[PDB]
Design an enzyme around this catalytic site. Structure first.
Site, PDB file in Angstrom:
ATOM      1  N   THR A   1      -2.868   4.701  -6.346  1.00  0.00           N
ATOM      2  CA  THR A   1      -1.898   3.772  -5.697  1.00  0.00           C
ATOM      3  C   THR A   1      -1.599   2.594  -6.616  1.00  0.00           C
ATOM      4  O   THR A   1      -2.514   1.921  -7.087  1.00  0.00           O
ATOM      5  CB  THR A   1      -2.435   3.240  -4.349  1.00  0.00           C
ATOM      6  OG1 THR A   1      -2.572   4.329  -3.424  1.00  0.00           O
ATOM      7  CG2 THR A   1      -1.494   2.176  -3.753  1.00  0.00           C
ATOM      8  N   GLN A   2      -0.313   2.358  -6.868  1.00  0.00           N
ATOM      9  CA  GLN A   2       0.121   1.203  -7.647  1.00  0.00           C
ATOM     10  C   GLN A   2       1.287   0.513  -6.943  1.00  0.00           C
ATOM     11  O   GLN A   2       1.607   0.813  -5.789  1.00  0.00           O
ATOM     12  CB  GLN A   2       0.542   1.604  -9.077  1.00  0.00           C
ATOM     13  CG  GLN A   2       0.156   3.003  -9.538  1.00  0.00           C
ATOM     14  CD  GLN A   2       1.188   4.042  -9.135  1.00  0.00           C
ATOM     15  OE1 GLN A   2       1.586   4.111  -7.972  1.00  0.00           O
ATOM     16  NE2 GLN A   2       1.632   4.851 -10.097  1.00  0.00           N
TER      17      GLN A   2
ATOM     18  N   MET B   1      -2.965  10.681  -4.326  1.00  0.00           N
ATOM     19  CA  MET B   1      -2.783   9.255  -4.013  1.00  0.00           C
ATOM     20  C   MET B   1      -2.527   8.400  -5.256  1.00  0.00           C
ATOM     21  O   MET B   1      -2.960   7.250  -5.331  1.00  0.00           O
ATOM     22  CB  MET B   1      -3.978   8.708  -3.220  1.00  0.00           C
ATOM     23  CG  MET B   1      -4.124   9.323  -1.840  1.00  0.00           C
ATOM     24  SD  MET B   1      -2.720   8.957  -0.767  1.00  0.00           S
ATOM     25  CE  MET B   1      -3.005   7.226  -0.402  1.00  0.00           C
TER      26      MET B   1
ATOM     27  N   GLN C   1       0.854  -1.224   0.000  1.00  0.00           N
ATOM     28  CA  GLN C   1       0.000   0.000   0.000  1.00  0.00           C
ATOM     29  C   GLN C   1       0.872   1.250   0.000  1.00  0.00           C
ATOM     30  O   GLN C   1       1.920   1.284   0.646  1.00  0.00           O
ATOM     31  CB  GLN C   1      -0.936   0.001   1.218  1.00  0.00           C
ATOM     32  CG  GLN C   1      -1.852   1.215   1.332  1.00  0.00           C
ATOM     33  CD  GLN C   1      -2.786   1.377   0.142  1.00  0.00           C
ATOM     34  OE1 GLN C   1      -3.329   0.398  -0.372  1.00  0.00           O
ATOM     35  NE2 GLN C   1      -2.987   2.619  -0.294  1.00  0.00           N
ATOM     36  N   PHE C   2       0.432   2.275  -0.725  1.00  0.00           N
ATOM     37  CA  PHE C   2       1.170   3.534  -0.802  1.00  0.00           C
ATOM     38  C   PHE C   2       0.926   4.383   0.444  1.00  0.00           C
ATOM     39  O   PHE C   2      -0.223   4.659   0.803  1.00  0.00           O
ATOM     40  CB  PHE C   2       0.781   4.325  -2.053  1.00  0.00           C
ATOM     41  CG  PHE C   2       1.381   5.702  -2.108  1.00  0.00           C
ATOM     42  CD1 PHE C   2       2.758   5.870  -2.154  1.00  0.00           C
ATOM     43  CD2 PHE C   2       0.570   6.830  -2.107  1.00  0.00           C
ATOM     44  CE1 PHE C   2       3.315   7.138  -2.198  1.00  0.00           C
ATOM     45  CE2 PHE C   2       1.122   8.099  -2.154  1.00  0.00           C
ATOM     46  CZ  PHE C   2       2.497   8.254  -2.200  1.00  0.00           C
TER      47      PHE C   2
END
Ligand SMILES: [Mg+2]
Ligand SMILES: [Mg+2]
Lengths: 240, 212, 204, 222, 233, 235, 231, 244, 195
Positions: free
Chosen positions: E1-2, E107, D1-2
């Site tokens: 998000t990746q 994000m 997860q970022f």
């Protein structure tokens, strides 16, 4: 959407659409407002060109905005319903957020604000309606009577009339209404209201409607016979 | 945190502690937990400090716009409901607020509204909010009367914060007092808990368990 | 937790010789707590009958919705809706809520006014039509009903025989289900008369 | 997860004098156990005799400082080159911070300068915009190491006058700019010894009526 | 998000007396698979700037196109596009830094660590860092990924502070960079022997060196090492 | 017909020029700025004796340090006042301070030209915005529907404007007291008003640093009218 | 005549009358002068008052530390265009850490004014602007017309009676361009230029408005007793 | 631009009238006459189809009388297509009300809703008004039997007997002459047909030129029945009343 | 909030509602009135999540009051209950549902009958002789099942209600600080101030 500027200034500085809306009010049936010492009375004309009418269900000229405020009008009938609806919603909205019913001045200021908005909004014409708004502020015994008109201006009045032949009944009220001593009782106030309408109405049969508003949400509409008794007493005194 | 407010004969007493903590770390001992909404209205801060500061400061702006438009002092009921309706719109988003909106008007008299980030809104006579609320409640409930003097009521509010300050680890620093009257609130000073405790202990004879 | 088994209740429908029958229990509950013994699950729009099991708020909502739609249908078509048409309407209406469905188990029953043909149908919560000749079941005792109906049912029963079969199918199924019972109603439907009977059963 | 947040370490310190104010901060920038830069300025002159530092996550810190500097510029345009007072700047910063209430600037912001009466002023902010005027405030990694020392040496807490034995407190005498700078330097020297994220260099910005002055000092680089 | 897929490892760089040096290997890894061996991760912008990029390669290619598009855009209605109003390293960096931070704030980050190395109009050395979070910093030596842990210590022995920059020549600086690349090849499991090196000097301009290789490697001592403790044979 | 935002051959906006004609028909409003305060005064002009004159609100509070007088289609001013009040309060919320009188006036004037085919026409009302701030002291502005605002030492707008402005030309000097200004507004209002000036058909107000913006009572104004009559009869 | 009802209509001779009427509003506006050397650029503006009680309408607006303009015509339109310039100057500084080129600032103004001439409903801007600035290629002076036409010049003037000042600058061209490293003398030439556009009235202390930008000089406006030196 | 071609449908005349409403009323005056008569035990709706043909399929035709719900019906005068747009909106409002409150919509609330829609077209939107006048015949448990009318202005009023369409002046006088308050449905049926027979522009009034309907409590016990008369039934009532 | 009861007798509807308002650890109030008058002859008591309860009740109140003014007519309890159900049924599939359970006690002036409607937060309406929400029914229904008669007087209903409250006070762990009782009949709504 339709964005056309219908209400606009002319070379002489007039907004004709607002002024032509007043001409629609001039055509409307006469409405009169008279405030006494502890009451306000709203008189309204019903043109007798329309018989075979059902007076039970026909829209009455005076309308309750809340349990303590009333609204009568002169001009376009269909237009009046839109202002009445908005006013009734704003009355409940005010109770919900402020936890207190609207003052008569506040409700007037709102309706007048709506009318004004329509004089400089695109794609809309002004309301062909002037209103008389009357009642008593919450926990207050001072009578209130206000007037509004298509342009959006509003003001307070000791007594006022609007509609057709309103010039005549205003002439009557200006000489008959005393500020230093207004109609002390309900009878005196109603009498002066009926008298003022009898200058214009024609017949005093079903053509006159009277609504009496008193402090603490005490509003009642007089019946035909009750009004007819005032009409009888006025003319009998006149025969002298 | 410990904040209280109670109605009485002479109006409203508002009393708060001054401590701010981030975990066990004492971030500040000089925090203002009474928001001066305007010269007539006070609000206490518990839960989220920013959320209480920001939105009650904002509430003051709304109260000002009200009395400009309506040419009349806003009611405590109306003021409190502007805040409660606002936070209710944000319900679920994670606002943290526990406040007493306190005021004294003609039509209402002295009025206190507990307002909550859950949307709760309660009128009442005595309210305590914060981690040390239970300690303050004990002193209040046992000593409270409607016919308290302004002097005694101020002391009761001060003593109740002190009770919490002592026992509750997340309350303390100093006590801020306010007295709300019809003509406006009156600030009754900052009182260091350290100095106040020994003063109260000696003069009152309380806290015998503690060695001084 | 499971919406289709919070309130409980059952519906069963059967076909007979020149007749149909539809029946339901009367229980509404909050899981273990019995709340109402008068919650009828069968409604009708003209001569078309609709039973609805499942989440009670949706049972109410869908009845109000099909009343709405069948009333506008009648005004425009100038005739009462038929069972075959109504079945498609129910299917359409459920599927338009494909990813947020009403938690219900509807059952249509009626006789076509023109052909005189007995008709029944059932649906899942998402609108898939089950058009069986013999019988349709629905609710928290659907397994019990399947067992009762499969053994008790025979084709071409007369109205007064069919009544006994559907009644015994419902009653004995509901007695093996905690969330069903508390009374029962049976509709016997013929082309131009409909008899409604309340059954006597154990009250728990 | 970022994870959109990070910790760039660092420690800052604001102290309000009688007719001056200082805002100090170490120049070390880090991630985890690595040093990014031994000199990366953290305290900034924002104009109108205001200094600012947004310690914590450096990207949000830089974004906030940039936006505030921009706010000062547009305050001049919109209001006839009026000087932004420190109290007005503080309220403006609250709204910048609270504007991202549900995705906060992960920073502990401090500003310093002079109030409208010419007295020293320091304002302290939490990440979501709660703020307060303060006399003394350390922020960042070694804030817990510095504040107790400041309570003792600036405000003379727990100190009493000899002979009286706990009856008379030590009087709160005013500190000069030279005296404050000594305490700042010793605070950072001590923080450098006992905190791994503090070191390399110390940069102090001193605000007076004459303007903003800078002072730099070396710190241990281990 | 990746998540990053095809990745590039360390970018290392340092300032010297007249300019800056930057280097990065030519590998595009696919996890543990050393998939692509001909990937250029140093991208020059004009004759005064070189942008070194590590991390996700698909995002690098996107950034590469943004910079190419930036040069085109700067030339529009600009008679001084190749003179006074040419792109500066500081303009290029600030643009990327803005983009990186905006993207992380939505994000949806560009999964990269970027070093912009160049020389300004007035001859000043420019060297600054930015990554997927939008975090920025400058230093006499800068490195990404493993370079931060292994290259920086070695490069900081040459230029330990600002005052060491005028004392450092291009030959000393290049030697230190080339040695650091060898150290990374020994120790970084996601590195390759082939790399590119760029020098931006205020006098001699941009010198871009392709197809360099790590050489002078020490492996001979490996023959003597036997077992993992007790084994003699 | 023709566009609402059309230019005339002379280089003026038709609708803006026409709205200025509507303002000429409006009741007179006069403002006078002094070093002791700014005075605002208006003609009420009741259309009938049954109209309760105290309900005529042509002088209005924007903030404690800013007042406002109007002239023309007064219904149009309500949204302008609302915006002004919001702008004043909003600025206080963002900056913890009073807002400059000029900045407030500029915020009001930004609305003016937001009309086209936004609102359908310009405002048919002119405003005299009077106030005080620490930077520029006591100030009086004239906000038009063109979007232009001029600062004035003294200014009259409405039907008797050009006659009153000529009178303000002679009478105003930099050392006027507040009391002198109050009488001067009453003097000039009485001159240009159709009906005879009294406390019921004319209103006064002022803004001072200490007490802020205040609308004068009819009893207070009545004394100033009586004081005026005597000083004019004095020579 | 029949082709001036809106901006979307060409005349038979290929003219846009609404734009030409907007141009006419500039001629009605008060005079303002612009001129520059190699080091500095100067704006001189004759402010106009409504009457003796009124203030003198401000003519000069600051856009950035290195750029600003003087207006002639509808002041509200100058506020909109100047605000737009402020944003573009600010966008360049924030995003690219780069001061906006004066030539590029002109291109932006041109394109903004153009969109108002080609679309139905809107109207052209009713103002002319003189933009001065100092960027990486030295001093600059631009003349903006609401038709969209922007022109880089050594010196110019716009407003009523501007032809007199414009002729003077055309003669003085070779003199004032050489005034390098001397702001006072460059302003003197600007004050002497604007004086050629005066009739009846003369340059008083609250009448005159001067602004300057240069090599080591941020854009600063001079009003009141600050310009008494040059009267 | 487009402004050039705009009729400006929603503006006042100098006299204070709405041009398009007035012209829509002129349009309606050329429509077939519709009459509503309210009695103590029911309401009668009578209407004249406009110059029909012998090849018109009458039994399946419907241009005048429409059903809004089981309790409320309308007689149309004006553009049929416009009326149907409004009729479907009214049918929906009635059902929305029923779904919300689980009670049949009161007649006046429905009438107000439709009349408010008409009003909207006169005040905003820049569209032409609906060229339609309705007579609403209906029943509810509050006011009992009710007759209303609405016109393109959005103004509605209550009536004991009323006409719309052509020759309303002549029709309204005839109704005002022969109407009484204690009248019954069978008497009202006769009056309605007699009025149309005199005001008609046709040479004679026949079954094929008429639509007819009654809202009666003449339904088995306390409930209301709508009866839309069939061609044969209109022919019978014409013989019964002695018109043919 | 916690306990809300309802019982329809011969000629009236009686609603009992607890007075306690608890916040985690402390009882903040012991005199809270968990009810709103929707119209002169219709009363609605409510219980559920904090904030939502009052916000919903007042929203309904405003809407019924608006209808009363517009039509100059009081809606039947059945009509009001159907309106309320629809709002809750609309609410359950919203972004953030109202977590509110209600009892609607009204007197129908047309039919001259008392009516009690129970509606939960899902929009599950039921007309009942007696009703409750939450755990209140678990303790009380066995007593109501036993003693209830449709021809009970108001005084008998109150006695049966006292027995229900006593059983709650005995077997419930939570101290709900007693109940406020209100009666809805032909003459309107009134509060039993001693209970
Ligand atoms: Mg170390
Ligand atoms: Mg329920």
């Amino acid at each position: 959407g339709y964005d056309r500027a219908l209400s606009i200034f002319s070379p002489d500085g007039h907004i004709f659409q607002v002024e032509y809306a007043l001409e629609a009010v001039k055509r409307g049936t006469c409405a009169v407002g008279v405030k006494g010492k502890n009451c306000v009375v709203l008189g309204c004309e019903r043109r007798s060109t329309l018989k075979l009418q059902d007076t039970r269900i026909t829209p009455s000229k005076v309308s309750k905005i809340d349990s303590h405020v009333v609204l009568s009008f002169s001009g376009l009938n269909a237009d009046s319903r839109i202002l009445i609806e908005k006013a009734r919603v704003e009355a409940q909205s005010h109770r919900l957020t402020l936890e207190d019913p609207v003052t008569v001045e506040y409700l007037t200021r709102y309706v007048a604000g709506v009318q004004q908005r329509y004089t400089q909004s695109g794609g809309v014409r002004p309301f062909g309606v002037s209103t008389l708004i009357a009642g008593f502020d919450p926990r207050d015994d001072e009578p209130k009577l206000y007037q509004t008109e298509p342009s959006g201006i509003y003001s307070s009045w000791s007594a006022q009339t609007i509609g057709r032949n309103s010039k005549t009944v205003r002439e009557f009220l200006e000489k008959n209404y005393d500020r230093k001593e207004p109609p002390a009782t309900v009878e005196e106030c109603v009498k002066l209201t009926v008298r003022s309408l009898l200058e214009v109405v024609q017949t005093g049969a079903k053509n006159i409607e009277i609504t009496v508003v008193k402090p603490d949400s005490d509003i009642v509409a007089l019946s035909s016979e009750e009004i007819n008794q005032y009409v009888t007493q006025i003319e009998q005194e006149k025969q002298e | 945190t410990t904040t209280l407010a109670f109605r009485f004969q002479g109006g409203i007493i508002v009393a708060v502690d001054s401590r701010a903590t981030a975990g066990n770390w004492v971030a500040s001992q000089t925090v203002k937990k009474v928001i001066e909404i305007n010269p007539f209205l006070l609000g206490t801060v518990a839960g989220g400090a920013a959320d209480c500061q920001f939105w009650e400061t904002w509430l003051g702006s709304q109260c000002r716009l009200h009395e400009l438009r309506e040419k009349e002092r806003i009611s405590v009921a109306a003021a409190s409901k502007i805040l409660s309706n606002l936070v209710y719109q944000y319900k679920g988003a994670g606002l943290s607020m526990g406040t007493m909106i306190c005021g004294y008007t003609r039509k209402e008299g002295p009025t206190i509204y507990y307002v909550d980030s859950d949307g709760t809104r309660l009128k009442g006579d005595i309210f305590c909010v914060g981690s040390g609320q239970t300690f303050a409640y004990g002193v209040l409930d046992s000593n409270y009367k409607w016919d308290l003097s302004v002097e005694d009521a101020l002391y009761l509010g001060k003593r109740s914060i002190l009770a919490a300050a002592h026992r509750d680890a997340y309350s303390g620093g100093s006590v801020n007092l306010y007295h709300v009257t019809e003509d406006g609130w009156i600030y009754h000073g900052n009182h260091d808990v350290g100095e106040l405790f020994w003063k109260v202990k000696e003069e009152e004879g309380s806290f015998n368990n503690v060695i001084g | 937790s499971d919406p289709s088994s919070i309130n409980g209740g059952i519906v069963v429908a059967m076909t007979g010789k020149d007749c149909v029958a539809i029946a339901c229990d009367l229980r509404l509950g909050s899981q273990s707590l019995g709340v109402s013994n008068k919650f009828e699950k069968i409604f009708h729009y003209g001569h078309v009958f609709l039973g609805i099991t499942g989440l009670a708020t949706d049972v109410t909502t869908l009845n109000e919705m099909f009343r709405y739609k069948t009333n506008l249908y009648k005004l425009k078509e100038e005739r009462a809706i038929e069972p075959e048409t109504f079945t498609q309407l129910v299917s359409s209406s459920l599927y338009e809520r494909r990813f947020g469905p009403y938690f219900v188990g509807p059952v249509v029953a009626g006789i076509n006014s023109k052909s005189g043909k007995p008709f029944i149908a059932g649906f899942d919560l998402i609108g898939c039509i089950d058009e069986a000749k013999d019988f349709i079941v629905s609710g928290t005792a659907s397994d019990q009903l399947f067992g009762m109906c499969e053994s008790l049912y025979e084709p071409n029963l007369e109205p007064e025989d069919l009544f006994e079969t559907i009644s015994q199918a419902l009653l004995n199924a509901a007695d093996r289900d905690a969330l069903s019972g508390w009374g029962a109603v049976v509709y016997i439907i013929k082309k131009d008369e409909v008899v409604k009977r309340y059954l006597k059963m154990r009250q728990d | 997860q970022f994870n959109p947040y990070g910790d760039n370490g660092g420690t800052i310190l604001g102290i309000a004098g009688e007719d001056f104010a200082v805002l100090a901060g170490d120049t070390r920038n880090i991630t985890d156990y690595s040093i990014n830069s031994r000199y990366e300025p953290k305290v900034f002159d924002c104009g109108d005799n205001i200094v600012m530092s947004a310690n914590g996550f450096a990207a949000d810190g830089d974004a906030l400082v940039k936006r505030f500097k921009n706010s000062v510029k547009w305050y001049h345009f919109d209001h006839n080159d009026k000087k932004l007072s420190i109290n007005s700047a503080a309220r403006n910063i609250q709204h910048l911070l609270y504007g991202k209430r549900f995705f906060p600037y992960y920073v502990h912001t401090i500003i310093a300068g002079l109030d409208e009466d010419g007295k020293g002023a320091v304002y302290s902010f939490d990440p979501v915009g709660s703020y307060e005027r303060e006399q003394c405030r350390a922020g960042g990694a070694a804030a817990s190491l510095i504040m107790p020392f400041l309570d003792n040496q600036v405000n003379f807490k727990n100190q009493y006058e000899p002979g009286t034995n706990g009856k008379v407190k030590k009087p709160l005498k005013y500190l000069s700019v030279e005296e404050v700078i000594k305490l700042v330097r010793d605070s950072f020297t001590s923080a450098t010894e006992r905190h791994i994220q503090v070191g390399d260099g110390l940069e102090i910005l001193i605000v007076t009526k004459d303007g903003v002055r800078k002072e730099f000092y070396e710190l241990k680089r281990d | 998000t990746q998540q990053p897929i095809v990745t590039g490892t360390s970018v290392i760089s340092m300032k010297y007396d007249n300019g800056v040096i930057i280097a990065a290997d030519n590998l595009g890894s696919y996890g543990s698979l050393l998939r692509f061996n001909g990937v250029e991760r140093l991208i020059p912008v004009g004759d005064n700037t070189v942008v070194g990029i590590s991390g996700d390669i698909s995002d690098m290619q996107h950034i590469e196109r943004l910079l190419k598009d930036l040069v085109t855009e700067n030339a529009y209605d600009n008679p001084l596009a190749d003179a006074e109003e040419a792109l500066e390293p500081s303009y290029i960096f600030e643009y990327l830094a803005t983009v990186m931070y905006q993207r992380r704030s939505k994000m949806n980050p560009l999964w990269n660590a970027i070093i912009v190395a160049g020389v300004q109009s007035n001859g000043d050395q420019f060297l600054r860092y930015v990554n997927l979070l939008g975090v920025t910093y400058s230093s006499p030596t800068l490195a990404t990924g493993f370079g931060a842990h292994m290259a920086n210590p070695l490069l900081r022995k040459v230029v330990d502070r600002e005052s060491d920059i005028p004392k450092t020549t291009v030959q000393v600086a290049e030697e230190a960079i080339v040695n650091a690349m060898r150290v990374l090849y020994y120790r970084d499991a996601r590195s390759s022997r082939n790399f590119s090196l760029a020098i931006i000097d205020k006098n001699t301009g941009l010198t871009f060196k392709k197809n360099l290789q790590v050489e002078n490697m020490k492996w001979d001592f490996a023959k003597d090492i036997k077992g993992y403790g007790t084994q003699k044979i | 017909d023709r566009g609402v935002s059309t230019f005339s051959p002379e280089g003026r906006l038709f609708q803006v020029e026409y709205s200025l004609e509507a303002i000429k028909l409006g009741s007179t409003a006069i403002g006078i700025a002094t070093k002791e305060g700014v005075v605002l005064g208006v003609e009420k002009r009741a259309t009938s004796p049954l109209l309760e004159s105290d309900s005529i609100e042509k002088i209005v509070e924007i903030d404690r340090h800013i007042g406002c007088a109007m002239s023309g289609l007064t219904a149009d001013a309500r949204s302008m006042i609302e915006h002004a009040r919001t702008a004043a309060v909003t600025h206080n919320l963002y900056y913890d301070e009073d807002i400059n009188v000029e900045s407030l006036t500029q915020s009001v004037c930004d609305l003016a030209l937001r009309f086209g085919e936004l609102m359908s026409r310009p405002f048919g009302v002119a405003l005299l915005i009077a106030g005080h701030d620490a930077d520029d002291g006591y100030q009086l502005f004239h906000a038009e529907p063109s979007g232009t605002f001029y600062r004035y030492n003294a200014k009259a707008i409405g039907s008797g404007s050009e006659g009153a402005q000529a009178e303000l030309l002679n009478e105003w000097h930099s050392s006027l007291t507040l009391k002198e200004a109050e009488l001067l507004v009453l003097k000039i209002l009485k001159q240009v008003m159709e009906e005879k000036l009294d406390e019921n058909n004319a209103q006064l107000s002022c803004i001072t640093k200490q007490d802020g913006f205040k609308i004068y009572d009819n009893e207070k104004t009545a004394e100033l009218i009586k004081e005026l009559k005597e000083k004019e009869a004095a020579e | 005549n029949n082709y001036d009802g809106d901006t979307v209509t060409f005349s038979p001779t290929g003219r846009l009358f609404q734009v030409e009427y907007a141009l006419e509003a500039i001629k009605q506006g008060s005079v303002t002068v612009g001129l520059r050397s190699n080091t500095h650029a100067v704006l001189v503006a004759l402010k106009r008052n409504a009457d003796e009680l009124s203030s003198y309408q401000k003519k000069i607006i600051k856009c950035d530390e290195h750029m600003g303009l003087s207006l002639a015509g509808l002041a509200p339109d100058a506020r909109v265009l100047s605000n737009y310039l402020r944003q573009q100057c600010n966008y360049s500084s924030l995003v690219f850490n780069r001061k906006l080129a004066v030539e590029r600032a002109g291109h932006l103004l041109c394109d903004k004014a153009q969109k108002n001439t080609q679309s139905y409903g809107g109207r052209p801007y009713g103002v002319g602007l003189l933009i001065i600035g100092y960027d990486k290629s030295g001093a600059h002076l631009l003349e903006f017309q609401p038709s969209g036409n922007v022109t880089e010049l050594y010196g110019t003037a716009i407003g009523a009676r501007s032809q007199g000042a414009k002729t003077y600058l055309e003669r003085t061209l070779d003199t004032f361009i050489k005034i390098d490293g001397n702001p006072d003398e460059l302003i003197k030439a600007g004050v002497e230029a604007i004086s050629q556009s005066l009739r009846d009235e003369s340059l008083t202390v609250d009448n005159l408005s001067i602004a300057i930008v240069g090599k080591d000089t941020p854009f600063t406006i001079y009003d009141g007793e600050a310009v008494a030196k040059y009267i | 631009g487009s402004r050039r071609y705009d009729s400006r449908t929603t503006i006042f005349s100098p006299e204070g009238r709405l041009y398009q409403v007035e012209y829509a009323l002129e349009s309606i005056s050329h429509a077939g006459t519709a009459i509503g008569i309210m009695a103590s035990d029911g309401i009668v709706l009578a209407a004249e189809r406009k110059v029909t043909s012998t090849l018109l399929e009458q039994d399946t035709s419907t241009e005048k009388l429409y059903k809004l719900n089981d309790k409320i019906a309308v007689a149309v005068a004006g553009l049929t297509a416009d009326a149907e747009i409004l009729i479907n909106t009214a049918r929906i409002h009635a059902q929305n009300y029923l779904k919300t409150y689980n009670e049949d919509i009161p007649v006046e609330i429905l009438v107000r809703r439709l009349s408010d829609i008409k009003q909207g077209y006169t005040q905003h939107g820049g569209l032409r008004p609906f060229g339609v006048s309705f007579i609403y015949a209906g029943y509810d448990d509050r006011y009992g039997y009710q007759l209303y009318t609405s016109n393109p202005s959005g103004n509605y009023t209550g009536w004991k007997a009323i006409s719309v369409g052509a020759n309303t002046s002549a029709a309204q006088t005839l109704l005002q002459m022969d109407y009484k308050d204690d009248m019954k449905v069978d008497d009202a049926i006769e009056l309605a047909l007699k009025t149309l027979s005199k005001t008609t522009d046709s040479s004679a009034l026949t079954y094929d030129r008429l639509e007819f309907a009654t809202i009666r409590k003449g339904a088995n016990d306390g409930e209301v029945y709508q009866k839309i008369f069939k061609p044969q039934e209109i022919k019978d009532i014409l013989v019964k009343t002695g018109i043919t | 909030m916690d306990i809300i009861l309802g019982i329809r007798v011969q000629d009236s509807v009686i609603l009992a509602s607890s007075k306690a308002v608890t916040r985690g650890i402390s009882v903040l109030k012991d005199s809270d009135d968990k009810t709103r008058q929707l119209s002169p002859h219709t009363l609605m008591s409510f219980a559920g999540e904090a904030g939502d309860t009052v916000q919903f009740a007042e929203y309904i109140q405003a809407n019924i009051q608006l209808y009363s003014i517009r039509e100059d007519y009081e809606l039947s309890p059945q009509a009001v209950s159907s309106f309320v159900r629809q709002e809750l049924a609309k609410s359950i599939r919203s972004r953030r549902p109202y977590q509110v359970n209600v009892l609607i006690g009204g007197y129908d002036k047309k039919k001259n009958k008392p009516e009690l409607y129970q509606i939960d937060y899902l929009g599950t309406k039921v007309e009942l002789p007696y009703g409750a929400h939450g755990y209140s029914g678990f303790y009380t229904f066995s007593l109501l099942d036993h003693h209830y008669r449709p021809d009970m007087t108001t005084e008998e209903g109150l006695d049966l209600l006292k027995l229900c409250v006593q059983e709650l006070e005995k077997r419930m762990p939570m101290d709900f600080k007693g109940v406020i009782v209100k009666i809805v009949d032909k003459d309107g709504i009134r509060q039993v101030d001693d209970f």
